[PDB]
Design a protein around this ligand. Structure first.
Ligand SMILES: CN1CC[C@H](N(C)C(=O)N2CC(c3cc(F)ccc3F)=C[C@@]2(CO)c2ccccc2)[C@H](F)C1
Ligand SMILES: Nc1ncnc2c1ncn2[C@@H]1O[C@H](COP(=O)(O)OP(=O)(O)O)[C@@H](O)[C@H]1O
Ligand SMILES: [Mg+2]
Length: 330
């Protein structure tokens, strides 16, 4: 059930000018990825894997958004809960896929930037798809990040990062938590998206100075909750509630990341049909417990490098991502 797509990234300038030979190959139509585990391009040993979708270095943001995100957003907009994770080693494109970047030289507007990733495209699309149509709706976002088993709010402008939040269990709905003091910001219009992300980015900078390897070691959860009162062309009024969580995981490479470790152990228990699934063992899996063998529609985007130096890590990531194909939820 859980859908797992692989995204390979392009070689950088340091790799192009250093004449880099991709040890990776992608077959979208065959949904397959091949990794040369040794030897030459003349003759070689290769390892093959089959996923739910595969995107090669040539894949653009728009490609990923139309192919994977738009269908998930329609489900959220149907009153569903969905979650998408970006998993992979540092330098492979987790943040790039989830948030994207800006085109150089102030070339574009944030709505047009071909470099924009999932989070920005998604927030812009919600206001598109709903505004036109006859829908009443509010949009709330929160940005909850985990570093060394502590919780931070990257959107609260009244508090500074160093203030960690407390998490408790939800006495109402089992298998869910309440995070005390976490800000939920209302996005009044599309021209409110940008400044929200501007503020999160800003705070991220301070978090980064307060904590070592922050961008590499933290897990970030950006959630958009949609409240809709849709009045069909007829006159019916459907009240729906959707939540999409977008998770940029800490680098997969290997102190200890308890949330990463637990995540991997939760997948193992799920796919090996073990009675005990160790959710409670980390903040992340407690937060996102419903996304793992829960009533949530989840997708994993595994990001790999094409360079030869990263073979062991890309192998490790493919292997990890293949296994999660066997987790049944919803
Ligand atoms: C000086 N400032 C100029 C603007 C800058 N900025 C806001 C951004 O460009 N973004 C932050 C972001 C994002 C930030 C979060 F906290 C959480 C989630 C997210 F998706 C996405 C992108 C960058 O890839 C983006 C790329 C494309 C379109 C919009 C935004 C930043 F403020 C520096
Ligand atoms: N699919 C991609 N296309 C183009 N550049 C990419 C892609 N994936 C990653 N990159 C680049 O690789 C670098 C590290 O990427 P980043 O998104 O920060 O990854 P991570 O969050 O996994 O550590 C950045 O320079 C980003 O420009
Ligand atoms: Mg990152």
């Amino acid at each position: 059930n859980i859908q797992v797509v692989v995204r390979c990234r392009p070689f950088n300038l340091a790799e192009r000018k250093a004449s880099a030979h991709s040890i990776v190959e992608c077959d979208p139509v065959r949904k397959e990825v091949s990794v040369r585990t040794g030897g030459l391009a003349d003759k070689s040993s290769r390892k093959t894997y089959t996923f739910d979708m595969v995107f090669g270095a040539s894949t653009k943001q728009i490609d990923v958004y139309r192919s994977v995100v738009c269908p998930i957003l329609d489900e959220v907009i149907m009153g569903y809960n969905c979650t998408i994770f970006a998993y992979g080693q540092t330098g492979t494109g987790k943040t790039f896929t989830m948030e994207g970047e800006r085109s150089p030289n102030e070339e574009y507007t944030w709505e047009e930037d071909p470099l924009a990733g999932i989070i920005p495209r998604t927030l812009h699309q919600i206001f598109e798809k709903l505004t036109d149509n006859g829908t009443e709706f509010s949009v709330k976002v929160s940005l909850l990040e985990i570093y060394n088993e502590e919780l931070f709010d990257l959107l609260n402008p009244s508090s500074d990062v160093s203030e960690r939040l407390q998490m408790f269990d939800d006495p109402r709905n089992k298998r869910g938590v309440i995070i005390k003091g976490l800000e939920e910001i209302t996005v009044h219009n599309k021209d409110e998206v940008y400044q929200i992300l501007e503020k999160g980015a800003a705070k991220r900078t301070t978090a980064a100075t307060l904590m070592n390897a922050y961008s590499s070691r933290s897990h970030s959860v950006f959630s958009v909750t949609i409240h809709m009162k849709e009045t069909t062309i007829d006159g019916e009024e459907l009240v729906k509630i959707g939540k999409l969580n977008l998770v940029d995981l800490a680098g997969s490479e290997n102190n200890i990341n308890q949330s990463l470790l637990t995540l991997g152990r939760v997948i193992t228990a799920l796919v090996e049909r073990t009675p005990h699934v160790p959710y409670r063992e980390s903040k992340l899996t407690r937060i996102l417990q419903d996304s793992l063998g829960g009533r949530t529609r989840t997708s994993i985007i595994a990001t790999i490098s094409p360079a030869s130096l990263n073979l062991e890590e890309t192998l490790s990531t493919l292997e990890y991502a293949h296994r999660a194909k066997n987790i049944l939820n919803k």
